[PDB]
Amino acid sequence: VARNEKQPFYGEHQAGILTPQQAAMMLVAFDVLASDKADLERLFRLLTQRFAFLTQGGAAPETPNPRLPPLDSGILGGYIAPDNLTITLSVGHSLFDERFGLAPQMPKKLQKMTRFPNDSLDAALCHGDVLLQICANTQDTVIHALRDIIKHTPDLLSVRWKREGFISDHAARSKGKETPINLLGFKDGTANPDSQNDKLMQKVVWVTADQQEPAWTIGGSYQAVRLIQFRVEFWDRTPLKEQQTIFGRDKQTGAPLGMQHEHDVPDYASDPEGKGIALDSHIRLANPRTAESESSLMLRRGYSYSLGVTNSGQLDMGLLFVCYQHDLEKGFLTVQKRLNGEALEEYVKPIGGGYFFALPGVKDANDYLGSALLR
């Protein structure tokens, strides 16, 4: 039964990273209003409490005294089903400024996101002290979580930016067995590293003790977020041949061009002029598939978005790109540097997002998010 699905909240790592993608999600960044490290700890403790309750489900908080605001928004009714909810907390570069004495604690590669050559960043949609990635089976559960978090933090958190996204229900319900199709009509996720292989994930996604990082970071992950708008109508009137040449993949099957099966692996060595798969194609640049490029593997966990219209009255739709990696410089920064100038660029418009560090897991009810960071 879908509404009763739960992902464990406690663990060595946060959920929402390796977790198979649920159908609905939200990215919401906040300014932190805490004035002391003390206030910050109270906030982190409070958040852990709210996330623990929401993700595992229970009866909605009641309001015995009606002269008070309702203790729950009510939008789910009387029972708060877990509905496969995960909440992942990450912290931005700006949390490590003067306010809370955490500067010495900053992850070695964490930085403020700065624009790439194809960027049109909107200042209202960038950065933040903290980001929550909130995913569940249904949008109702995600919004209810947000409203709960907000009601509990008037003194501590102020919403900075928010965007909601989705993947198809049936792809979500296959728990990774079927690749989601993005709003350009291409399968998106095919070449992701196996999130179930724990040794691969220890190398690819998680910060490990062997890295040159502050101790508290161990078991967390660097997180790059990009809000990317599509030129939908322009894309839809583009020849199929060109769409495929831009990506490097067959639209229908998802296979690398020239091959038969979605998950087949291209051989770039036997195609040095890119007659088969173009040298400026998205996948060839994202992953050159050389011995040296293997250090730039990442776990992508992106969602589609659809809003209203743009300022030109064209459809506002795109990608909430999210990726996790053991090292921000070796992962996202390296890959995007390779992607600069790719054929796709004229079709997409990065307008927002930022870089964050996803905290390590919370061990149990006596622990709280950020405990190692704050001590």
Find the binder of a copy of itself among 54, 76, 87, 102 (CB under 8 A): 76
Q: How far apart are CA 122 and CA 125, in angstroms?
A: 5
Partner whose footprint covers residue 332, from a copy of itself, ligand HEM, none (CB < 5 to 8 Å by kind): ligand HEM
Partner whose footprint covers residue 283, from ligand HEM, a copy of itself, none (CB < 5 to 8 Å by kind): ligand HEM
Q: How far apart are CA 349 and CA 59, in angstroms?
A: 43
Find the binder of a copy of itself among 88, 105, 137, 287 (CB under 8 A): 137
Tokens, residue 207: 């910060």
In this structure, how many other beta carbons lie within 10 angstroms of the beta carbon of residue 214?
Answer: 16
Query: Toward ligand HEM, which CB reaches closer, 21 or 287?
Result: 287
Tokens, residue 18: 């390796």
Is residue 254 within 8 Å of residue 248, measured between CB atoms?
no
147 belongs to the binding site for a copy of itself (CB under 8 A): yes
Q: Give, in order, the Cα–Cα distances in Å from 84 to each of 144, 332, 367.
A: 13, 28, 22
314 belongs to the binding site for a copy of itself (CB under 8 A): yes
Q: How far apart are CA 196 and CA 18, in angstroms?
A: 8
Q: How far is the CB of 156 from a copy of itself (least distance, A)?
A: 14
Stretch that binds a copy of itself, among 99-107, 109-117, 203-211, 240-248 (CB under 8 A): 240-248
Work out the burial of residue 364: count CB atoms within 10 Å of its CB; fewer than 13 is exposed, 13-18 middle, 19 or more buried: exposed
232 belongs to the binding site for a copy of itself (CB under 8 A): yes
Angle value at C-alpha 148, between 146 and 152, nearest 5 degrees = 115
348 belongs to the binding site for a copy of itself (CB under 8 A): no
The residues of the shown chain that bind a copy of itself, judged by CB under 8 A, are 2-3, 63, 66-70, 73-78, 124, 137-140, 143, 146-147, 150-151, 154, 158-164, 166, 168-170, 181-183, 185-186, 232-233, 236-241, 243-244, 251-252, 306-309, 311, 313-315, 317
